[PDB]
Amino acid sequence: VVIGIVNNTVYDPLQPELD
Amino acid sequence: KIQDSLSSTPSALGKLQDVVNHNAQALNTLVKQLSSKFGAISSVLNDILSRLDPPEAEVQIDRLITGRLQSLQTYVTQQLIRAAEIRASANLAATKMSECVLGQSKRVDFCGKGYHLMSFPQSAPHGVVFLHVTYVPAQEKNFTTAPAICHDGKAHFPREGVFVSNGTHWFVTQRNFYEPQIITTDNTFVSGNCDVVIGIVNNTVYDPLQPELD
Amino acid sequence: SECVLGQSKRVDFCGKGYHLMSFPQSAPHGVVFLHVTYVPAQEKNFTTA
Amino acid sequence: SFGGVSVITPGTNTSNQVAVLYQGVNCTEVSNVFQTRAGCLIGAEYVNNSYECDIPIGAGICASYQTQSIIAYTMSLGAENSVAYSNNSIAIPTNFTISVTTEILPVSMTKTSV
Amino acid sequence: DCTMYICGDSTECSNLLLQYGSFCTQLKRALTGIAVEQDKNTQEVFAQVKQIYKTPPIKYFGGFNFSQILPDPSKPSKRSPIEDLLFNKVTLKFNGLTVLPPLLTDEMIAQYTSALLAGTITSGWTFGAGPALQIPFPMQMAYRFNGIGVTQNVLYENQKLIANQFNSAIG
Ligand SMILES: *[C@@H]1O[C@H](CO)[C@@H](O[C@@H]2O[C@H](CO)[C@@H](O)[C@H](O)[C@H]2NC(C)=O)[C@H](O)[C@H]1NC(C)=O
Ligand SMILES: *[C@@H]1O[C@H](CO)[C@@H](O)[C@H](O)[C@H]1NC(C)=O
Ligand SMILES: *[C@@H]1O[C@H](CO)[C@@H](O)[C@H](O)[C@H]1NC(C)=O
Ligand SMILES: *[C@@H]1O[C@H](CO)[C@@H](O)[C@H](O)[C@H]1NC(C)=O
Ligand SMILES: *[C@@H]1O[C@H](CO)[C@@H](O)[C@H](O)[C@H]1NC(C)=O
Ligand SMILES: *[C@@H]1O[C@H](CO)[C@@H](O)[C@H](O)[C@H]1NC(C)=O
Ligand SMILES: *[C@@H]1O[C@H](CO)[C@@H](O)[C@H](O)[C@H]1NC(C)=O
Ligand SMILES: *[C@@H]1O[C@H](CO)[C@@H](O)[C@H](O)[C@H]1NC(C)=O
Ligand SMILES: *[C@@H]1O[C@H](CO)[C@@H](O)[C@H](O)[C@H]1NC(C)=O
Ligand SMILES: *[C@@H]1O[C@H](CO)[C@@H](O)[C@H](O)[C@H]1NC(C)=O
Incomplete structure (x- = not known):
């Protein structure tokens, strides 16, 4: 729906922790 | 629609035409006051000098001089008053320009009615016309609310927005636009127990990390 | 406009202290504003970094 | 008894009808005659619709x-x-509208000298 | 009235005055302009609300007592007791001079004030920016506490004390 949207990695800090 | 509003209403620029009308009227009355005799035999110094000799015409010339001096003094007094008024108006206009065009002012009703978004200046012969683009809510709806949520014996308050309900369910939503969100730990903060708060309700505050950590 | 119909961040326009709200009141030749404001107290000393 | 008289007029553009207002005068001492706190009004009928x-x-x-x-x-x-x-219960706006309000302010007079 | 003031009933005095010119036109114009200016000031000051809002019959707002600022129907003029005290504490054609009445009567100014009060206590700051959204007064107070940099829990945990202090302050 958003115009001009782009792609990039959005890291989640919970993944490296793996709680 | 701005252009239609300016075209249909001829008296829209009356606040700006009034100053021109006042200046024109002042000049017109100052010009017309010359015909006043001010108690003299005539209003024309040429005839006053031609008819009488200097000895007896000096009194008439002095009378006319006094009258015209007083008239001009009153005129300049009115001019100074109107100049002070227009100076105050220009100060207000400059403040409005600075606080609405060069930026956004939290002032509730300075740059037009409603939540101000931005402004655009437009030239004028003797003034300035501001186009205040504003934000006005509309199409509201009723909702049930509670000041906090009691979960796990603890009170939950919203970080931004308010708790709302449409029956059998609860959500968080920003106050200026309806956007229901699930009540989670990301949009709420805990402070003390839930027994001290008045009017608190109980609803599930889903932990966003518990499902993945389990 | 500023005090009654909203909440101003101006520190001294709607009364002393942090302004919460204001209520207007009529008068034969004017208006009387009742500025409800917030004032702290009991300024305890603390060590900060 | 004396007082100024004002002429209520809808403008010659519309009609020639006019109503006169005797400021502060009680018309017990000088077609519809109506008394108001501002004076007596002759030529205008009091309508109860606001x-x-x-x-x-x-x-x-x-x-x-x-x-x-x-x-x-x-x-x-x-x-x-x-x-x-x-x-x-609360009321929350499910919508919004962008409006443009027009404002005018005078900035200068006509520079004059005598 | 120039005639009445300067000359009165003297017709010869009026004839002598007619020689001075158009001073009295300017005088009357300035006086009428001052009158219209005072009327416009009163209007711009007291007619800021769009519509006359009403107050609910149940005068309960979470412990906050507005009886001293809300209108009291127990007297002829619908004015609050504070407004009545303010009006009581303030005390209020002669050969040409006259005093014209204002357009908005005292009752109309009081009605505008009551509308503003009802709006402020029933819809927060929204009635001055669009539709009057009905909102609880403790939540308005939480909004304003957040506005002054204090969290909402600081209110909700002291609501009773805060309301008592506010009532004492009004008193
Ligand atoms: C918010 O309001 C706008 C306009 O008031 C709504 O937009 C309208 O949507 C309907 C159906 O989607 C269309 O038929 C209209 O043409 C739209 N109006 C305009 C001016 O384009 C919008 O849907 C509203 N939003 C919500 C969530 O109700
Ligand atoms: C982003 O990725 C989606 C799918 O992976 C693709 O459809 C879209 O075109 C991409 N946009 C950009 C700006 O790379
Ligand atoms: C809320 O309900 C009342 C009736 O109790 C109704 O008059 C009002 O219009 C409703 N609110 C909205 C935004 O429709
Ligand atoms: C309340 O709103 C939610 C929005 O997700 C909807 O799923 C639910 O069915 C609604 N409930 C009622 C009773 O309208
Ligand atoms: C809300 O108001 C009603 C009526 O005044 C009252 O009965 C009720 O207790 C109030 N709610 C709370 C949480 O005090
Ligand atoms: C904080 O310390 C100063 C300096 O010793 C003292 O004057 C002041 O009273 C202290 N604060 C309080 C609340 O007593
Ligand atoms: C006459 O002109 C005036 C000036 O704009 C306007 O207010 C009025 O409505 C007009 N009347 C008619 C009948 O056109
Ligand atoms: C006008 O005179 C009548 C008769 O004396 C009196 O009843 C009325 O109150 C007077 N009105 C005004 C405005 O003076
Ligand atoms: C307004 O009401 C008064 C009092 O009943 C009445 O005398 C008058 O005729 C009414 N005006 C009209 C236009 O009917
Ligand atoms: C508000 O205070 C007044 C004066 O003390 C009192 O008469 C009134 O009962 C109070 N309001 C309530 C709801 O008790």
């Missing part, structure tokens, strides 16, 4: 062209709007 103020007379009374005759009426401050208050 409308916006077209021509201000005084003491909360105004006059305007009916369309047909000059009517006098007590000006309306606005339409009543009762707000449903409740300590457990």
Whole structure:
């Protein structure tokens, strides 16, 4: 729906922790 | 629609035409006051000098001089008053320009009615016309609310927005636009127990990390 | 406009202290504003970094 | 008994009808004659329907062209709007609208010298 | 009235005055302009609300007592007791001079004030920016506490004390 949207990695800090 | 509003209403620029009308009227009355005799035999110094000799015409010339001096003094007094008024108006206009065009002012009703978004200046012969683009809510709806949520014996308050309900369910939503969100730990903060708060309700505050950590 | 119909961040326009709200009141030749404001107290000393 | 007289007029553009207002005078001592706090008004009929103020007379009374005759009426401050208050219900805007308000301000006079 | 003031009933005095010119046109114009300016000031000051809002019959707002600022129907003029005290504490054609009445009567100014009060206590700051959204007064107070940099829990945990202090302050 958003115009001009782009792609990039959005890291989640919970993944490296793996709680 | 701005252009239609300016075209249909001829008296829209009356606040700006009034100053021109006042200046024109002042000049017109100052010009017309010359015909006043001010108690003299005539209003024309040429005839006053031609008819009488200097000895007896000096009194008439002095009378006319006094009258015209007083008239001009009153005129300049009115001019100074109107100049002070227009100076105050220009100060207000400059403040409005600075606080609405060069930026956004939290002032509730300075740059037009409603939540101000931005402004655009437009030239004028003797003034300035501001186009205040504003934000006005509309199409509201009723909702049930509670000041906090009691979960796990603890009170939950919203970080931004308010708790709302449409029956059998609860959500968080920003106050200026309806956007229901699930009540989670990301949009709420805990402070003390839930027994001290008045009017608190109980609803599930889903932990966003518990499902993945389990 | 500023005090009654909203909440101003101006520190001294709607009364002393942090302004919460204001209520207007009529008068034969004017208006009387009742500025409800917030004032702290009991300024305890603390060590900060 | 003396006092200034003012002429209520809808403008020669519209009609030649006019109503005269004797300021402060009680017309017990000088077609419809109507007494108001601002004086006595002759030539205008008092309508009990409240409308916006077209021509201000005084003491909360105004006059305007009916369309047909000059009517006098007590000006309306606005339409009543009762707000449903409740300590457990709220009203939230599900929409919004962008408007553009036009404002005008004078900045300068005509530079004059004598 | 120039004639009445300067000359009165003297016709020869009026004839002598007619020689001075158009001073009295300017005088009357300035006086009428001052009158219209005072009327416009009163209007711009007291007619800021769009519509006359009403107050609920249940005068309960979470412990906050507005009886001293809300209108009291127990007297002829619908004015609050504070407004009555303010009006009581303030005390209020002669050969040409006259005093014209204002357009908005005292009752109309009081009605505007009551509408503003009802709006402020029933819909927060929204009635001055669009539709009057009905909102609880403790939540309005939480909004304003957040506005002054204090969290909402600081209110909700002291609501009773805060309301008592506010009532004492009004007193
Ligand atoms: C917010 O309001 C706007 C306009 O008031 C709504 O937009 C309208 O949507 C309907 C159906 O989607 C269309 O038929 C209209 O043409 C739209 N109006 C305009 C001016 O384009 C919008 O849907 C509203 N939003 C919500 C969530 O109700
Ligand atoms: C982003 O990725 C989606 C799918 O992976 C693709 O459809 C879209 O074109 C991409 N946009 C950009 C700006 O790379
Ligand atoms: C809320 O309900 C009341 C009736 O109790 C109604 O008059 C009002 O219009 C409703 N609110 C909205 C935004 O429709
Ligand atoms: C309340 O709103 C939610 C929005 O997700 C909807 O799923 C639910 O069915 C609604 N409940 C009622 C009773 O309208
Ligand atoms: C809300 O108001 C009603 C009526 O005044 C009252 O009975 C009720 O207890 C109030 N709610 C709370 C949480 O105090
Ligand atoms: C904080 O310390 C100063 C300096 O010793 C003292 O004057 C002041 O009273 C202290 N604060 C309080 C609340 O007593
Ligand atoms: C006459 O012109 C005036 C000036 O704009 C206007 O207010 C009025 O409505 C006009 N009347 C008619 C009948 O056109
Ligand atoms: C006018 O005179 C009548 C008769 O004396 C009196 O009843 C009325 O109150 C007077 N009105 C005004 C405005 O003086
Ligand atoms: C307004 O009401 C008064 C009092 O009943 C009445 O005398 C008058 O005729 C009414 N005006 C009209 C236009 O009917
Ligand atoms: C508000 O205070 C007044 C004066 O003390 C009192 O008469 C009134 O009962 C109070 N309001 C309530 C709801 O008790």
